[PDB]
Every structure is written in C-alpha cells, then in structure tokens.
Design a protein around this ligand. Structure first.
Ligand SMILES: NC(=O)c1ccc[n+]([C@@H]2O[C@H](COP(=O)([O-])OP(=O)(O)OC[C@H]3O[C@@H](n4cnc5c(N)ncnc54)[C@H](OP(=O)(O)O)[C@@H]3O)[C@@H](O)[C@H]2O)c1
Ligand SMILES: [Ca+2]
Length: 159
C-alpha cells in the first residue's frame, strides 16, 4: 500500500520556492513518527532540499538523470520506485508536487497536516476528489508557544 504525507497551508500550498515557510514542531514530530522505518519516495527537488538521507528509512529518489550520491536509491520511473521498496507494508511518498500528483491515483491513504496559515507558494497539493476518501482520523490543535499556527492532523483512506 502506498501512502502520501504532506503539510498544506491555505489553498493547498505545500511549498514556496522549494521551502516550507512555517515552524511547526508538532508537525515534524508527526512526520517522523509516521515515516520511521518505512521507505520514503521523493522527487529530486525534494531530495536537494533535504541535503542528507532521512535516517531510519530507505531513501528512494525519483529522477530522470543518473544519481549523484550513493547514499540513496535512484530510480527513473514510478513503477521502478515502487519495485525498489520491496514487499513492505507501507510506502510513504513525501513530495514534492509533481511526485504527489503522480502517486495520488495509486495511494490508499493520505496523511495530511492542515495548517492555519496563509503563504504564497509555487506549489500545491493535487486537488483530490473528496468523495473518494474517508476521514478516519482527525485531531485539531490550537497554536501554542512552540507552534505559531493552529493545525489539524488528518488521515484519509480511499473508499
Ligand atoms: N508541505 C509539504 O508537506 C511538502 C512535502 C514535499 C515537498 N514540499 C515542497 O514542494 C516543493 C517541490 O515540488 P516539486 O514538484 O519537486 P519534486 O516533486 O520534489 O521533484 C521533481 C523531480 O523529480 C524527478 N521526477 C519526478 N517524477 C519523475 C518520474 N516519473 N521519472 C523520473 N523523475 C521524476 C524529476 O527530476 P529530474 O529533473 O531529475 O527528471 C522531477 O524534476 C517545495 O516548495 C517544497 O518545500 C512540501
Ligand atoms: Ca471501503
């Protein structure tokens, strides 16, 4: 099963100029917890932005070009990246926009963080059919001294 995980602000903005504007620690903790010990798939721009491999997970990078770093697994196709994960129970796709659009149709679960913030970005999460997904879990949180905005964690599963 494939899952997608993303943090979205107002207007489904996921990012601006390859960066996440906000500071949400609670959000980092949710991501880590949901991805630990699972393979993660990401697009080359995302990888660039991360700089080093996420520890405790198999890092698969999608790019059309040959890889340039032996610490991660390079693949050139969606199907290739899925095969590189082997027989694990859940594959986590981590962005960016172009990757999420591609994996959406195959995904069975979406882990989303809706952040109450207004930012301008150049990329948006794919517009998905809400009728096709069931909201199985949802927990809202008010801003606090560590978290500057309110946010809500949500998990959806494809009907
Ligand atoms: N808010 C969040 O949760 C979240 C999560 C992830 C990312 N983001 C954000 O999103 C931005 C990035 O999105 P973008 O789009 O970049 P991306 O998605 O990270 O990367 C796309 C690159 O991946 C490679 N690729 C994609 N599909 C491919 C395929 N089928 N075959 C081969 N290579 C493929 C291509 O690289 P080549 O050019 O090498 O072919 C493509 O240019 C930033 O602003 C960032 O902060 C946010
Ligand atoms: Ca069902």
């Amino acid at each position: 099963m494939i899952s997608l995980i993303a943090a979205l602000a107002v207007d489904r903005v996921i990012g601006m100029e390859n960066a996440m504007p906000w500071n949400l620690p609670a959000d980092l903790a949710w991501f880590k917890r949901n991805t630990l010990d699972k393979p993660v798939i990401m697009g080359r721009h995302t990888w660039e932005s991360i700089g080093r491999p996420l520890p405790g997970r198999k890092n698969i990078i999608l790019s059309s070009q040959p890889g340039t770093d032996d610490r991660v697994t390079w693949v050139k196709s969606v199907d290739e990246a899925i095969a590189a994960c082997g027989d694990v129970p859940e594959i986590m796709v981590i962005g960016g926009g172009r990757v999420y659009e591609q994996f959406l149709p195959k995904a069975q679960k979406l882990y989303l963080t809706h952040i109450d913030a207004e930012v301008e970005g150049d990329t948006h999460f794919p517009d998905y059919e809400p009728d096709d997904w069931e909201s199985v879990f949802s927990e809202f949180h008010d801003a606090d001294a560590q978290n500057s905005h309110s946010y809500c964690f949500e998990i959806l599963e494809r009907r």
